[PDB]
Amino acid sequence: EVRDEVAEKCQKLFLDFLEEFQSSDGEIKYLQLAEELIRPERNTLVVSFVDLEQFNQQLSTTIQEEFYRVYPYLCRALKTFVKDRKEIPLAKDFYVAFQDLPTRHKIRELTSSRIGLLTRISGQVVRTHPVHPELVSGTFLCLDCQTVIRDVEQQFKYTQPNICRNPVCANRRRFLLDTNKSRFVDFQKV
């Protein structure tokens, strides 16, 4: 029922930007780059912030001012755009990353004023930790009634269903993770 209108408008306009932004020469820039995502190893598409700026200042400003709230809707736009063009296994998921941002902030300027806003910094690395797999969307099997629960999205602590859609089950604990149809992403700290 409820819909975040601001987010939906951003999704529509960002899709139009990807499909309509012609180069200095005449071909659609990001359409050509998108073809590399067919490779198994590739997940992330890089977008230039100044290119985004040329389409409309309102969209540029909204993205920077509302980034964390809006970000998952940009991924859906790229997912849709790629799916149109060439065949890829449908279980794969795609990511958007921005660069050429016009400004820079000091470490001591990073304060709770700008939680959630798009930002750029620089520093010197002291230590770097191993790679791990991180769960983003779980699939669970409810054992007492043999029914599957899909796209259980995670937050900081590991969360799961406790009662299923199937009403006769009366379960609370007997749930099994499908580690073959769940999906993960690579994670690293520095």
Binding site: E1, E5, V6, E8, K9, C10, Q11, K12, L13, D16, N56, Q58, T62, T80, T147, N166, P167, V168
Partner: protein
């Protein structure tokens, strides 16, 4: 599971892009039919066949590549017609039992997959070519059966609903229904629908074509569809930037109001105040623990959680939302709609009305006929073509027919408790169509032609002289209920009432008095019937959403309310604490500048209240309770 998965493999196999059938494939599909003939009531064979994905894997290649074998083609078509039959028809209802509910949902899931699989244009192309050949015969019973099952196959494919909850697509993107509809155009299958609708001897198929066409157009309303044009690209682009701008602005404003209301120091800074002289529920003055700024807009209830409602106490709600399809689809639909109205409407309506009158033992669904006339009359009026394009429907028989159907639905909704929800839906559909008839006769008055104006006077004369149309609105208002109907029904009813009163008033002006079914009429006496306090309660409920109501809705309701209060002098019926709470919220909102008529009417009636209250202190008690007509009139006497 494994038994069917092993045996179903018999049909054939795929070599790159060439499909090779087995030499006993016909006997194999006969065995699949033998499985279905002894299927369980849970539809287990269908779920097994769906799990094995036989339709997607083999039947589509067989139909596309091996259709030259007409007996095999016939077998495959009838098999998938049985398999694709809608789940509601297979189970007979949405099941109450959780096991059968799960099976229903799984069957419907496989049907959704079949609908996606059928999106290949080659299937529609072969079907259209086959049907084109069959109609050239001017035939055997098996040929008629093949026509029948072709039409029913595309009907079944269209019928199973799209999961908008699964798709979650933005407007102007194509849903499964949209893509399949575009494939109908790309195949040219639509041309055969227009042939069947326009050809007189094909009347037996026209009843099916009505269901096909009405299934296609469901997402697009005719007014906005008539609106479209080639410049819509820039229009949507610019408008969307403006919408995004106002949305951002509204969030900013609301944030700042909250920011000023909150104190500046942190949440543990403390303090405590005594409100000297303001006694508690207890024997002593109130102690206030919150921040100083909060007292500027204090109400004691602010700390309380809402009352927890019982499960069965909840009101009705909508299971649907407004949408727009892709511009290509919108343009195609507009062309098809224009061509149907140009060539097919009057002939098809005559045929369908003939079948509904004759074939009562067959129990044909009248709601489609009413849907189609409601849709095409609205499109025709939105385009403002000559009334001659919709000639067949412009007669008294339609009003009588729909009145008896609507009153039958009303009586059934009251009596047949076990199906009152569906009877309410049927009744709502009938009301919508009737409103379009009234709008049509209203429109032709402002035409330049005296002949159609006289015809308009004849129709309106019969409608106002007879009892039923003027009594019906009061019958619906009397039995409106929050579990029975959602607020959309109430909006349609009150707007139709405003239109009916407008035309009634214009008709009464023609002579010194109007006589009706037998008594001398009086417009004010008729309006006095609506002074029932239940009707006002329904009006107040509709007024709570004035910001979400349409401009036309707000105009209609406020016009009727002022007339009823002022000219009937029943003003004190509106002295209610619930209404006064709504007035308080109304005058508090900074968006009040958009609602000048409503705020001025509110201040006017509150002025009447305070003028009375200055004389008579009993008004503060009466404000808590609903009035009988005698009490409304007695309050001014005291």
């Amino acid at each position: 599971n494994c038994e069917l998965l092993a045996t179903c493999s018999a049909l054939g196999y795929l070599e790159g892009d060439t499909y090779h059938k087995e030499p006993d494939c016909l006997e194999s599909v006969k065995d699949l039919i033998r499985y279905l003939r002894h299927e369980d009531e849970t539809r287990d064979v269908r779920q097994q066949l769906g799990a094995a994905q036989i339709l997607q894997s083999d039947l589509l290649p067989i139909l596309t590549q091996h259709h030259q074998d007409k007996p095999l083609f016939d077998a495959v078509i009838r098999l998938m017609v049985n398999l694709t039959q809608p789940a509601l028809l297979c189970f007979g209802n949405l099941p109450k039992e959780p096991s059968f509910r799960h099976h229903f949902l799984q069957v419907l899931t496989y049907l959704q997959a079949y609908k996606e699989a059928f999106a290949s244009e080659k299937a529609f192309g072969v079907l259209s070519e086959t049907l084109y050949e069959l109609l050239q015969l001017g035939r055997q019973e098996e040929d008629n059966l093949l026509i029948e099952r072709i039409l029913l196959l595309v009907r079944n494919i269209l019928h199973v609903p799209a999961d908008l909850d699964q798709e979650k697509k933005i407007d102007d993107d194509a849903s499964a229904h949209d893509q399949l509809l575009w494939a109908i155009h790309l195949s040219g299958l639509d041309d055969l629908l227009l042939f069947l609708a326009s050809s007189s001897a094909e009347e037996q198929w026209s009843l099916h074509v009505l269901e096909i066409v009405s299934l296609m157009f469901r997402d697009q309303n005719p007014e906005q569809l008539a609106g479209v044009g080639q410049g819509r690209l820039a229009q949507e682009r610019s408008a969307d930037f403006a919408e995004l701008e106002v949305l951002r602005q509204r969030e900013m404003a609301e944030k700042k109001t909250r920011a000023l209301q909150r104190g500046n120091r942190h949440s543990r800074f403390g303090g405590s105040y005594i409100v000297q002289g303001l006694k508690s529920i207890g024997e002593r003055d109130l102690i206030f623990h919150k921040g100083l700024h909060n007292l500027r807009n204090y109400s004691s209830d602010l700390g309380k959680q809402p009352k927890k409602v019982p499960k069965r106490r909840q009101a009705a709600r909508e299971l649907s939302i407004q949408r727009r399809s892709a511009l290509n689809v919108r343009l195609f639909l507009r062309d098809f709609c224009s061509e149907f109205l140009e060539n097919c409407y009057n002939r098809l309506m005559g045929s369908v009305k003939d079948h509904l009158l004759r074939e009562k033992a067959q129990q044909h669904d009248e709601t489609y006929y009413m849907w189609a006339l409601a849709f095409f009359m609205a499109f025709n009026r939105a385009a403002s073509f000559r009334p001659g394009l919709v000639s067949e429907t412009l007669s008294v028989r339609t009003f009588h027919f729909i009145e008896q159907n609507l009153t039958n639905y009303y009586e059934m909704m009251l009596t047949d408790r076990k199906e009152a929800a569906s009877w309410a839906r049927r009744m709502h559909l009938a009301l919508k169509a009737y409103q379009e008839l009234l709008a049509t006769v209203n429109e032709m008055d402002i035409s330049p032609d005296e002949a159609v104006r006289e015809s308009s006077r004849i129709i309106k004369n019969n409608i106002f002289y007879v009892m039923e149309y003027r009594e019906l609105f009061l019958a619906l208002f009397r039995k409106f209920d929050e579990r029975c109907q959602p607020r959309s029904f109430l909006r349609d009813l009150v707007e139709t009432t405003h239109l009916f009163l407008k035309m009634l008033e214009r008709f009464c002006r023609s002579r010194g008095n109007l006589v009706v079914q037998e008594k001398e009429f009086n417009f004010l006496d008729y309006l006095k019937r609506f002074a029932c306090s239940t009707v006002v309660r329904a009006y107040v409920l509709l007024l709570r959403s004035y910001q979400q109501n349409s401009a036309h809705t707000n105009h209609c309701i406020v016009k009727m309310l002022h007339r009823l209060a002022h000219d009937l002098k029943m003003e004190a019926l509106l002295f209610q604490l619930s209404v006064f709470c709504l007035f308080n919220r109304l005058l508090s909102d900074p968006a009040a500048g958009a609602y000048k008529e409503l705020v001025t009417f509110a201040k006017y009636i509150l002025g009447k209240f305070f003028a009375l209250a200055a004389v008579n202190q009993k008004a503060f008690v009466e404000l808590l309770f609903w009035k009988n007509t005698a009490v409304v009139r007695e309050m001014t006497e005291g």
